[PDB]
Amino acid sequence: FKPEELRQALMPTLEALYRQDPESLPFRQPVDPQLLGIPDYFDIVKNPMDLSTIKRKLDTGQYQEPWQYVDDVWLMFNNAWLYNRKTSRVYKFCSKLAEVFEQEIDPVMQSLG
Numbered sequence: 768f769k770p771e772e773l774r775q776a777l778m779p780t781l782e783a784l785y786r787q788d789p790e791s792l793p794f795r796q797p798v799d800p801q802l803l804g805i806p807d808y809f810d811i812v813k814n815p816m817d818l819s820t821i822k823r824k825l826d827t828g829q830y831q832e833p834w835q836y837v838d839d840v841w842l843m844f845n846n847a848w849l850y851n852r853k854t855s856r857v858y859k860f861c862s863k864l865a866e867v868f869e870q871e872i873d874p875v876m877q878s879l880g
């Protein structure tokens with residue numbers, strides 16, 4: 768897939784996540800465990816992922832095919848469901864993002880083939 772085609776098709780699905788307030792706020796930047804006072808984060812989360820990293824990968828042509836993008840979004844979600852307790856804002860915000868993403872990504876992936 769050409770990188771410009773992936774950007775054009777997939778960026779709106781990422782924008783849909785960014786638009787969610789308050790739910791996207793913990794996901795907009797890479798987790799900094801010491802700054803956030805969660806120093807065990809990388810012990811539990813082996814492959815961190817966040818919206819800004821995903822955007823950078825689209826912008827710099829790092830995805831060869833669209834399932835790699837879907838996999839990074841899902842990695843971000845699974846990290847949050849793994850690390851955080853079920854009562855936490857991050858956990859519940861993650862669940863909302865996953866609802867939004869599911870709706871956005873469906874027709875786009877059908878269109879890309």
Ligand SMILES: C[C@H]1Nc2c(cccc2C(=O)NCC(F)(F)CN2CCCc3ccccc32)NC1=O
Binds near residue numbers: 789
């Ligand atoms: C992905 C990673 N995020 C954090 C996790 C735990 C603790 C903090 C974060 C985090 O990102 N802090 C930065 C923030 F900007 F989000 C601050 N702030 C904005 C308003 C809404 C809100 C809600 C909950 C926590 C903080 C927060 N667990 C995780 O799995």
